[PDB]
Design a protein around this ligand. Structure first.
Ligand SMILES: O=C(O)C(=O)Nc1sc2c(c1C(=O)O)CCNC2
Ligand SMILES: [Cl-]
Ligand SMILES: [Cl-]
Ligand SMILES: [Cl-]
Ligand SMILES: [Cl-]
Length: 299
């Protein structure tokens, strides 16, 4: 609402003009929770982790419904006051794509949010874990899942795909929505915060964030940097609508709360700054502000 927006724009200006983004970000890194990741660091799970320095805390990790090995590099972020849950995970590996879709099935997710490209800066950041062609579906033999591209809607800043995920054991099928932000730059943050807020609204509008489904699955390459940006902005925007006076939302506090559930969320001070801008812009759109109706129309 109006007061939450005023306080946040005020705080943004305060930080920006003082050039305090780096100090604030370093404070966040210093204050951030430290919890054990013993399961992630077991020798048998080394090939299930994309990055040796990015692991899920034991207490919040997602468990596959597996007797042999229940490990996947994924964390449940449960935001109590905001009443939102998110699963943040690394980009699947050649050998963990079956695990990824097993997790989607078992957690009853409706949406997958992808914030990276399969190739970035000349290297592979994520396995091609979904089919690119309707007529070439994918079978994940280890978890007995079939995945078919049904349709896709290619926009300038993002792509939405309708996928059908089928449990081959039971022959039940589910519609999964793939929300792919395809224009995050190789260096720095997106030039358009409004395009990112708009992307979030498309995810929201599908129902993929709603309590009647399991938690949305969000990923970048490591599932902490861009992934943290997405969930932080969504939760801060929600809180800005639900608090009485004082209605203000403290982004640092929300981010520290989220970092209780997964390490390293938001990987740069630029990403922190960008999170502010996306929240500010999104709130203006929500409130029907006429000034942002313009450049939002070519979106
Ligand atoms: O994709 C993101 O936004 C993200 O968090 N990426 C991260 S975080 C992170 C790495 C990467 C990577 O992609 O190489 C490499 C090792 N250190 C931590
Ligand atoms: Cl082991
Ligand atoms: Cl891609
Ligand atoms: Cl707060
Ligand atoms: Cl960090």
């Amino acid at each position: 609402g109006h007061m939450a927006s005023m306080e946040m724009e005020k705080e943004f200006e305060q930080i920006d003009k003082s050039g305090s983004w780096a100090a604030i970000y370093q404070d966040i890194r210093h204050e951030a929770s430290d919890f054990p990741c013993r399961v992630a660091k077991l020798p048998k799970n080394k090939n299930r982790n994309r990055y040796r320095d990015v692991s899920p805390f034991d207490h919040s990790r997602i468990k596959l419904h597996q007797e042999d090995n229940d490990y996947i590099n994924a964390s449940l972020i449960k935001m109590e006051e905001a009443q939102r849950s998110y699963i943040l995970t690394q980009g699947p590996l050649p050998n963990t794509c079956g695990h990824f879709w097993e997790m989607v099935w078992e957690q009853k997710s409706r949406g997958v949010v992808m914030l990276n490209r399969v190739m970035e800066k000349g290297s592979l950041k994520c396995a091609q874990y979904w089919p690119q062609k309707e007529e070439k579906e994918m079978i994940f033999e280890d978890t007995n899942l079939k995945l078919t591209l049904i349709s896709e809607d290619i926009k300038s800043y993002y792509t939405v795909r309708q996928l059908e995920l089928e449990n081959l054991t039971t022959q039940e099928t589910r519609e999964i929505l793939h929300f792919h932000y395809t224009t995050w730059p190789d260096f720095g943050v997106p030039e358009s915060p409004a395009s990112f807020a708009n992307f979030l609204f498309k995810v929201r509008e599908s129902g993929s964030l709603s309590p009647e489904h399991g938690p949305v699955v969000v990923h970048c390459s490591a599932g902490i940097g861009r992934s943290g940006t997405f969930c932080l902005a969504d939760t801060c925007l929600l809180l800005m609508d639900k608090r009485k006076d004082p209605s203000s939302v403290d982004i640092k506090k929300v981010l520290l709360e989220m970092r209780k559930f997964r390490m390293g969320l938001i990987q740069t001070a630029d990403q922190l700054r960008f999170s502010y801008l996306a929240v500010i812009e999104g709130a203006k759109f929500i409130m029907g502000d006429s000034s942002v109706q313009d450049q939002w129309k070519e979106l």
